[PDB]
Amino acid sequence: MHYLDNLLLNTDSYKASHWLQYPPGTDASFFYVESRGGVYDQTAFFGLQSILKEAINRPVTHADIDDAKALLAAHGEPFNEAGWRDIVDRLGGQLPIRIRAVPEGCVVPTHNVLMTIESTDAKAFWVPSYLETLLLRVWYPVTVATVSWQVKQIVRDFLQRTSDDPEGQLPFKLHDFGARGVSSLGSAALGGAAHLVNFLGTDTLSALLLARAHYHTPVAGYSIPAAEHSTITSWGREREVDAYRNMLTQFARPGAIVAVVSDSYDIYRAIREHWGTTLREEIIASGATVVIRPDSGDPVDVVEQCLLLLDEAFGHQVNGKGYKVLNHVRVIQGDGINPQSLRAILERITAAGYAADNVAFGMGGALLQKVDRDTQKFALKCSAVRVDGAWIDVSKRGRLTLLRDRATGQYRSALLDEVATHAGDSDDALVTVWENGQMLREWTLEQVRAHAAARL
Amino acid sequence: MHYLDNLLLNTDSYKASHWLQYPPGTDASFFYVESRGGVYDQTAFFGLQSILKEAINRPVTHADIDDAKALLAAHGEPFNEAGWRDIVDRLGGQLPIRIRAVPEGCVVPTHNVLMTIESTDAKAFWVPSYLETLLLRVWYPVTVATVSWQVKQIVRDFLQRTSDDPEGQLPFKLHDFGARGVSSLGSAALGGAAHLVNFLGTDTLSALLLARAHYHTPVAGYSIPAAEHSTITSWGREREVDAYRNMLTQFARPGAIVAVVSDSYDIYRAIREHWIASGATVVIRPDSGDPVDVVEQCLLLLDEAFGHQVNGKGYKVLNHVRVIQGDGINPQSLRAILERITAAGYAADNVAFGMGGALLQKVDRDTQKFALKCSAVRVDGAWIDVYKDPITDQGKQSKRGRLTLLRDRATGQYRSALLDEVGDSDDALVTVWENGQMLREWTLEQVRAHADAARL
């Protein structure tokens, strides 16, 4: 990625000449980030720590300026060469900004300050605006973390009603399969880590690498061996049961979990005859759990059909809450899953008397790629500048922060002046996470996961 | 950055388990890529060269294996340590695969082979499937290049009918400003470069860096200084005319082009309520109103204040001023604008378009139904077709066997064909990459030539 290792070019073109647009005598600038609404009423704030670590990873250099000046000139943009040289020569190439943010993992209602960015040097007051492009991409990890968090609340509800161990089951019920469906490796890593705020199951190895490098977590998630259509069908139709038996031979051990896509030829026959008759005793003797995966048919209907046929072959127990738990086998549905279809499946199977323990869900592109900056109407806005020594407002206005009520937990946005006058009942909910080149507050993924305490 | 620098972990977790699942006697695999349909009936192939240069940038090493071995064990996957050590020790850490692709920039109807991947080593025959995750993300640059190419064909049609210089105007008519609305820096670079296949205007500086590093083109695109609305709002309402005045004295010079943003109502007051010498062209961007209506109204008002000349086709061309619409632009609304303004008698010269998230982010793997399928394997010395039964395949695999793409000599038409059958057609794929060596590479100039030659 060394070709992209120049912070001065990690911006929109027109920002190269933007400093010339401020009023004469401008001395400082203040910006905030918020969700202005969208699909969900609240957002799980995540990813700013990774953005800052990766995008601002070294001092700016004179060679950075040389390359940027030449490229921008031929590209058609003026460039503040003298201003950047001053940052290199006088400020050590460190950016004079202060960033404050709500602790990552907190879930905050929309229309609220989530981050603020302020200039810390009078001559280089324009730096916050230069960083708008790379900082506003925080919309992506926030939105993925929010989608994942919203799904977690849905599953938790049905597990509460129908399972004897809701919180033991819950972290494995949404599995991220989206690395092939997202637009970049870097997006897979950050989007996948955003899912891991809420769940433990992932096939996005890049998310483990980002969690290890940026969130102090050596092993942030887990997965299982799983068959693909192409390995099954390479055996030939006549050897479908041998392909399945090989999955057991390689991977079925006591306590192990193994997923097998079972619709290469006919999933009803696969369950009734191959798994449920020919291989049944081998599965029982393995001590393993076999997870059946449909990959065709109506997503809701086929999950219920699978549970019924698996029940007929393997039996069930009834749990403390009166719901059936299949013996030795589970179902995972990755096809056609969104929060609406996921809730529909859970509604269908619990109404048929099956515990939500029996099923798990996969999302791929619907989680990592079918999100955009408008999903939660993300915005980064200038709220105040200092001109001739006086702070001037630029409907949210002035130097702002986020407050949290100590008794109710409710959030609201406020002027910084009111942290003192409202020291009763409310605390400042933002913390300073980055200032003048120094990251000042780091979270572990464990801490982020603890914050994501939020229910609704 | 460096935390993602291990090709062995740039895959889905279950791919670590995958080689154990093939039948005894397997020793080759074959894969093809196609678009199965979707929004558009043809796709511009672009981006594989950047994916290969960045994702496979060095030989695999023993250190890579040690790191992958330890993480995957903790994560829950088996790992083919011996197979990877053999690749490092016997094959120099070079991946034993052959990739063939249509030359980048070529535009191919859907339902056609665009790429094939085949194993080249009998022991390491499982390597192509291991790379499926990172290779399938070629869907993204192909899809962005396709959206941009489809916009180019619409604008081309209207310029041919109403402009005296269609091909001179065309490359500046769609401007990318998606860098803040895309999910990561890497996606901004690769998606932004996909737009540069068709057009010259971009605010995505990351795309310039990728075009230079991966497509050998140091200055691939251009932009102009542009007023930020909120910075103008920082001068105070009583000095808003002062703010726009500053914009021109800083940037407006003879051959220059400068953009000013404005609320549509203030364009009215400026010309009808009353609220040329620099030699520059000023491009006005309205920020309010309906996209089709407001562009027509701006042209009418601007005609009042600046006048126009009639070109050789009979259409009015404004003096000194142009209009760019960057709000609400998608291919359908862009065509509605061109219909309206040309019905009003204005040449397509007068207007340009911007797309942001709508170009770089609001696309997914389903936009062009992008597929990568294993279509054949060799087992016990015989090549066999690989496929799900038609009743469960749901149309996702249209082809079987070892395949290529042909170009008809008489008609220039593309069609897909079995390699064993391959008469008045030439093979349209070239071998771009084999066993660690990039065998055919393109400059962006060549890519653009391919795409610009394609029509409809």
Author numbering:
A (entry chain A): 1 to 394, 406 to 463, 465 to 468
B (entry chain B): 1 to 275, 284 to 430, 435 to 468
Show sentences the authors wrote.
Nicotinamide phosphoribosyltransferase (NAMPT) plays an important role in the biosynthesis of nicotinamide adenine dinucleotide (NAD+) via the nicotinamide (NAM) salvage pathway. Here, we demonstrated the NAMPT-mediated salvage pathway is functional in the Gram-negative phytopathogenic bacterium Xanthomonas campestris pv. campestris (Xcc) for the synthesis of NAD+, and the enzyme activity of NAMPT in this bacterium is significantly higher than that of human NAMPT in vitro. Our structural analyses of Xcc NAMPT, both in isolation and in complex with either the substrate NAM or the product nicotinamide mononucleotide (NMN), uncovered significant details of substrate recognition. Specifically, we revealed the presence of a NAM binding tunnel that connects the active site, and this tunnel is essential for both catalysis and inhibitor binding.
